[PDB]
Amino acid sequence: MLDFSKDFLFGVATASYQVEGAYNEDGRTMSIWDTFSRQDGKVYKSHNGDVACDHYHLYKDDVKMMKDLGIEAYRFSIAWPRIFPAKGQYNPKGMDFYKRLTDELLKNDIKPFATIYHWDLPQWADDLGGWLNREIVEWYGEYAEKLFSELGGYIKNWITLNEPWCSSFLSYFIGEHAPGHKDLGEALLVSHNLLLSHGKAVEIFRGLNLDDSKIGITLNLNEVFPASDSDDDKVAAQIADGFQNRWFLDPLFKGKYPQDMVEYFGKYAKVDFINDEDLKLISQKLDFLGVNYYTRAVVQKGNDGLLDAVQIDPGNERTEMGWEIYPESLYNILMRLKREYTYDMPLYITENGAAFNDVVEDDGRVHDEKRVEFLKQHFKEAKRFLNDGGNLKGYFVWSLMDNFEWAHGYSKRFGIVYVDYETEKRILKDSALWYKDLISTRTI
Ligand code: NA
Ligand code: NA
Ligand code: NA
Ligand code: NA
Ligand code: NA
């Protein structure tokens, strides 16, 4: 009688640096993204998150907005530089914000899902080497343990890391994200130290044995298609799939990095950080996997260089990111996990959404028909996965509100709510009204 059971979680998602603002208030010190956004050329028009959506001050209005939409769960991240603004220096004023935020959520019948690390590493940690320094495993563990102990009565659903592919390859090899290095060997070591840090938090979590509490990780996953049936394009797709997906799925769920990628990367950089003890910590059993899904890739062999597959445009509709709208890959990825990696383990879609050219019309509305249709198509694939026996427990739309989209600044709008940054006014887009109906009727 319901396409989505009463227990299924309809959610929305944000991240601390993208929405909070108050970047210099109540003891917060700089993150690597405060620093990166002030470096010339790194972020669109030198945008930064000084103010962002001002959610730090407006959170009660924002929670009331979610309650009026019927939101059942809220995924947010916790800012390490508010909690430990200096090495070993706990900031109770920072913790107090997340207590009042999550108290507000619970009292409005919204389940909190907390991401421990969503890219806002404290500058003091980066100045000590950051994710390249294996000591970060202990700093991150201390941070995670403090969150579990102070917030365990408030939060029962924990995500260690958001999108470690971005924190490693996009931040240290491609250089689009903070701290902006361009060195394959560095990105590979960072990927390992991120996974090891995840493992340390899971070890700490299990030792605490918090009542009715669950822990997972969030991975951005795609599906890779070869442009043709040629052997050249088949190898290109295998490499692209190993680079985005298997480099993280295999150590987490198989306890081994993908050997084809170890050998491939080993032609270009050191891969000597791999060892049995570390992979045992990395692959500890999780309670759930969070999947961030946006698009697929169609790839053709390049010129035998490092990770140089040519991106093919198959001619279909795209978002303002240039990302193909291809909802079938949401189902294909969830099924792949069910058949190859996670089996019967609970899955959540921890992000899915789209950037379009949103305008407030003279009627004061945002008629984002393309986002309505985008979300409709993807929720229909989530329903199809459920009806084929998939263990999907919830779905978080990225994002609750328009926000600071990293190197794009405020120029890309992902919200189901529009933000007028001059006034910080929130305007429900038509997609928010559609989602409110989906939650109320549980029908699609
Ligand atoms: Na911010
Ligand atoms: Na700036
Ligand atoms: Na697991
Ligand atoms: Na679970
Ligand atoms: Na499709």
Distance CA 287, CA 284 (A): 10
Q: Has 118 been labeled as part of a binding site?
A: yes
Q: Are 191 and 228 in contact (CB under 8 A)?
A: no
Give the Å distance between the CA of 120 and the centre of ligand 1: 10
18: annotated binding-site residue? yes
CA 95 to centroid of ligand 2, rounded, Å: 26
Cα 221 to averaged position of ligand 2 atoms, centre (Å): 30
Cβ proximity of 165 and 114 under 8 Å:
no
> Alpha-carbon distance 198 to 344, whole Å?
22
Solved how?
X-ray
Q: How far apart are CA 329 and CA 381, in angstroms?
A: 9
Q: Is 351 a catalytic residue?
A: yes
Residue 169, Cβ density class (10 Å: 0-12 exposed, 13-18 middle, ≥19 buried): buried
CA R_g for the chain: 21
Q: Tell me: is residue 398 an annotated ligand-binding position.
A: yes
Could you give phi then psi for residue 81, rounded to 5 degrees? -70, -15
163 is catalytic: yes
φ and ψ at residue 397, rounded to 5 degrees? -70, 130
| Residue given tokens 């789209």 in the structure block | 354
Exposed/middle/buried for 276, CB within 10 Å: 0-12, 13-18, 19+? Answer: exposed
Q: Is 135 annotated as a binding residue?
A: no
Residues lying with their CB under 5 A of ligand 1, a single-atom ion: 17, 20-21, 49, 52
Which residue in 72, 163, 186, 381 is the catalytic one?
Answer: 163
Q: Residue 427: how many CB atoms within 10 A of its CB?
A: 17
* Domains defined for the chain, CATH in brackets: 9-441 (3.20.20.80)
Residues 6+ apart with CB under 8 A from 78: 16, 98, 114, 115, 116, 147
Q: How far apart are CA 328 and CA 320, in angstroms?
A: 20
- Give phi and psi for 9, each to the nearest 5: -100, 115
